[PDB]
Symmetry: C4
Subunit: 388 residues, 4 copies
């Protein structure tokens, strides 16, 4: 109808309720489920759907062998109905590639897929299910993007891309798209020293992105975008409650403008909701691997370098595999505020479970409640032994 405008602020997050879960790996043990990774969730005005990068093969299919690899010509961004598994028969291909983002601007959806060899990748921006714009690699080193939904405001949908090294300074750009066309792009500015895989959400005409500093930071870089002025700033979450993985143990004081040291060249896509006292951080429980998942209320995490948790909720037990996580909200829901939501990728297979030759995942997602709900843990649920 009309372009959506971020007119509401976040609802108060007092707990998290179950939103969606597809049990993909369980079901896929005996049905035609596509092998995936890098999933997310994204809403249209009339429906919310699960998204992910397919590996172009079923889990039980012999071609599942080798899917630990990140970029092949057989991957594609696919979407499928909320809480269903990604099957050969119900998956809709949005575009071809090995890194993506997607978002609805209120009128129609924009989807972006990047494909190519490491030194010659390119992104193609689709809008209303048609290719509209293409961007060639600018640093010739794995052009890559969010791996979760972008956010739009009055037709303007900003997207964060990175091209260059994963273990040294790279060239991060913020592109402002409108109807699939480029209105403007900026180089990254601010104090964030490295950016990859931004998880974004919007509220009151501002877009907040919690990304990852793969090079040096165990605290997360944050990019705040003004989609009207089409400008932004960057910093790190000041809080001592470190949220990347792997990471060192939590200190008593964090860092606001530099990566918190202790772990280099590694990390996991993650997210946060930074809203003063209504601030919640997500993170793996393990400091060593993609294991477990919890939500911690850390009032003023973004700006308070000594902020520590005041409440929390366990999403996945430390004895269960987690993975990537990101933000999304249903901007077309009823009510006076936007309800914060997120998903956690539950990785199964390689490298942690090497008795099988594949790597895939299932999805679990939650949204906020103003109630103080009881908690449950939500594991993938599959028995690897069955696949042997």
């Amino acid at each position: 109808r009309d372009f959506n405008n971020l007119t509401k602020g976040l609802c108060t997050i007092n707990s998290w309720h179950i939103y969606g879960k597809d049990n993909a790996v369980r079901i896929g043990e005996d049905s035609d489920v596509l092998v995936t990774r890098e999933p997310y969730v994204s809403c249209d005005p009339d429906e919310c759907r699960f998204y992910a990068l397919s590996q172009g093969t079923t889990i039980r299919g012999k071609h599942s062998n080798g899917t630990i690899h990140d970029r092949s010509q057989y991957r594609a961004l696919i979407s499928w109905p909320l809480s269903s598994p990604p099957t050969v028969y119900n998956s809709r291909v949005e575009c071809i590639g090995w890194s993506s983002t997607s978002c609805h601007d209120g009128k129609t959806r924009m989807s972006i897929c990047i494909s190519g060899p490491n030194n010659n990748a390119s992104a193609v921006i689709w809008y209303n299910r048609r290719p509209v714009t293409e961007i060639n690699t600018w640093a010739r080193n794995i052009l890559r993007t969010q791996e979760s939904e972008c956010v739009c405001h009055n037709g303007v949908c900003p997207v964060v891309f990175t091209d260059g090294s994963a273990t040294g300074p790279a060239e991060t750009r913020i592109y402002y798209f409108k109807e699939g066309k480029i209105l403007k792009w900026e180089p990254l500015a601010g104090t964030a020293k490295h950016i990859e895989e931004c998880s974004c959400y919007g509220e009151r005409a501002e877009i907040t992105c919690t990304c990852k500093d793969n090079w040096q930071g165990s605290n997360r870089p944050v990019i705040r975008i003004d989609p009207v002025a089409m400008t932004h700033t960057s910093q790190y979450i000041c809080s001592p409650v470190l949220t990347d993985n792997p990471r060192p143990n939590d200190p008593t004081v964090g860092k606001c403008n530099d990566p918190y040291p202790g772990n280099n060249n590694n990390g996991v896509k993650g997210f946060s909701y930074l809203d003063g006292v209504n601030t919640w951080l997500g993170r793996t429980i393990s400091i060593a691997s993609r294991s477990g998942y919890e939500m911690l209320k850390v009032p003023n995490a973004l700006t308070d370098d000594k902020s520590k948790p005041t409440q929390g909720q366990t999403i996945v037990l430390n004895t269960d595999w987690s993975g990537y996580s990101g933000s999304f909200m249903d901007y077309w829901a009823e009510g006076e505020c936007y309800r914060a939501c997120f998903y956690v990728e539950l990785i199964r297979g390689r490298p942690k479970e090497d008795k099988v030759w594949w790597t895939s995942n299932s999805i679990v997602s939650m949204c906020s409640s103003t109630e103080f709900l009881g908690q449950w843990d939500w594991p993938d649920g599959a028995k690897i032994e069955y696949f042997l």
Copy 2:
């Protein structure tokens, strides 16, 4: 369009005709059918669909092992086209959880799923396919609901929940929802001593629920709700024709305000249509197990403590497995009266058929006819031996 109003009375029930049957277990022996239990049927203004709690695995899948269990993080309320089986590819997830209810108010549908550990469960109320309200457990002991459709009147859709013991007094509540929001809730009142799994239907601005007294009663508790005044009453079906299972043999006089004794801490979800002489009771044929199913016309069953059958119809032979049963009607059909309908869950597998490691079911459903139709029996139809 406009909210539906219960303006019609029931059609005269002279017999029951076949409405839907999915042969899920038969078909699922060689196709991707999800393992389920606790099914029901529910209509929208333009379509009627089968509903059930999936176990997050196919019947032939190795994860089918263990599905006798009631509550896991892998269950979800799903719906699928009338008379089709619940397949991985045609099942639509309504919400995540292990106890549910759902109903269309004329404009859109409300679905409720409860999930959690036994001492920390919570219900999330979805409306127009979005989460709107959440209710935390109040007795910290398996918050649970209907397992069949709720009914709406002018936007108000009452739902019965129980939290607390299954073998002693519990805390039953009646919530009146409108657009997924809570308008009001009452504690159970009346003479019903325990309530679980209410089967409801509406006619002439009144909602009748036939539930189950798991603690002491072999006769069924009945809750009648006024959705305008948002008030209710409770009692038991007075009739000597006992309809719970297991149960003692039928006496010559029943009980109107206390559970009829003989069997404790057990029972099965069931239903009835209480409409003076146009009264029909459903029940398993066996007094010991979920075996067989019959419909008995027991004029004035609700209020006459010596009422006995005047007509009847066999739905499932005592040599076939039955299970849960419940009411639903198509409130958007043509004509001057609402046609009473019900479904019977045909349980296969554990605990009765333990040569297989799974528990699932198929569905059979009937609706009333003003004709006096010939009867047939409708078994699940699957041969367990094939699954060995």
Copy 3:
């Protein structure tokens, strides 16, 4: 929109072109295709679909064993997209039963399914996907109907039913339905001595049905219905070109008002287009079994007792299995005339191919062309050996 009216006459049939073919048995050798029999085709104003009686199991499924049987509680009328196979995932159940008919009146569709034991069957008439009317068996001996589409005119859709013996006189009735309700029913009248499985089509406000005399006739009975006056007549196709199966060799003179003798208590559903010189008869090539299929132009077959073929077209080679056949037309096509169409059921499995324990079929269908097209033969295409 508005009820359809049979305002056009038939197009001139100079040959038959390929319309649809689903290759169900071939494809079903390695995919989830339902076992069926008694198929047909029927159009809605915006789509034409394949219809059939499912057996409630896949072909490869173990429950396929025994599907040679005609009536079980596991059968249902299903429809699926033109030329696709009837799969577990794309089949839409219209109603439950073992004998059916269905037709669109221009506004919505009426579907009829009969279920029951032999001595207590009943038909339930569905309209706009809801049950509206029920009719109890009147002769207590396998109430049965067309097994192909009915035809409507200004809301009135006549249907032919038979109840009673298959090898002696029975009670045949013509019901005139409008919006699923009974307007009137007549007993069969005319000279037809036995009626079963009528194949009907309409043109210029008249409905012609070519049925089968299972008891004594090798020539086919024909019922012509006036859907306005709601009256009918009956006779046999006068032609010496006999079209039932099994049957005696063709004589040089047929019979107009009595069954042509030579074969008792047996036959196959078949059809014809009786339109003066524009007359075409379908029949199996073999006089002994459901083998082969051909179309023969027999000018004035209905009224000329010495009429013999003037043109012809082979549909299925005598070295291939055929089966039932029937008429349908797309009454919502463009143009000035209705294009005659028909389908042939290609039966595979039992009783002719007993190395497998199942019985199923695929469908081939043709429509007329005013051109004189080259002919091809259209077999089922499956290799039984593969199923062993």
Copy 4:
């Protein structure tokens, strides 16, 4: 709405970006994917879909044995969602046959399928999903058509057919259809000596078709059609950069009005975009087999007999199997110009990979970019060994 008119010229082609890829053979190793060949892509005003000739069996199905054959009664034109594989469950049959074409005129789609024995084939023209016209073979020798989309202008959709020898002069006809009806047909005229499988596109009220001279030419014949005057001309691409396969090595001067010699009675469906300096030719890399695929910018190829490449892009490595290729464009996209697109059929199985008994393919497709994008190669991706 209104008939589409070719009002735009081509966008400038500076490179090719990835459009769609279904990885059919990979996925089909463990899911219900139909065996196909002769694929293409075609757009409707609201969706673009993959098309192909099914073989009426799955790849893993036993009936896949023998699918190297071209024409059987089990083939049909099917379409399915962009980038999905052609599965039993998501494939929509457009018509029955072994040679086809299809195109949307802006209001609705016309699809054409030819079926029959070699000496008695016939084409049936479907419009708005109904059969409208039939054309009988005129040379009684494999009536055949494009195997890719046709193009329409103001309701007029020209189609090229060939009937007669594959190794000598044949009877090629250009039919001008409007709403499935024949407006006019011409015999081929111009200097093209043999025509088969035309790949067409339209721009500025002109339709260009790049076909194949199976008899003598290694350069490609080109037919330019005026769909208003309903007239055409024919010649060959003058360029020395030869684009058929098999073929001799490239000379330094080509031929404008006669087949370039060196290879007889063989070839592959191919295409080109002839637009002055904005000219791009597609071809297999190997001169001996359907191996590899590249796009070469050959300014003025059509008219310059010494034109050689000025830019290029590799689509498939010479160490990977290719096959047929053709043109299509989304005539309903936004913007001021039509974006040239094409697909390459990636053939797997027989005759080149004879360890398996089947022949099938997957599809890869690209569209033009005005950017100068980095290139990647796009192979089928399946491991034949897995199928053994």
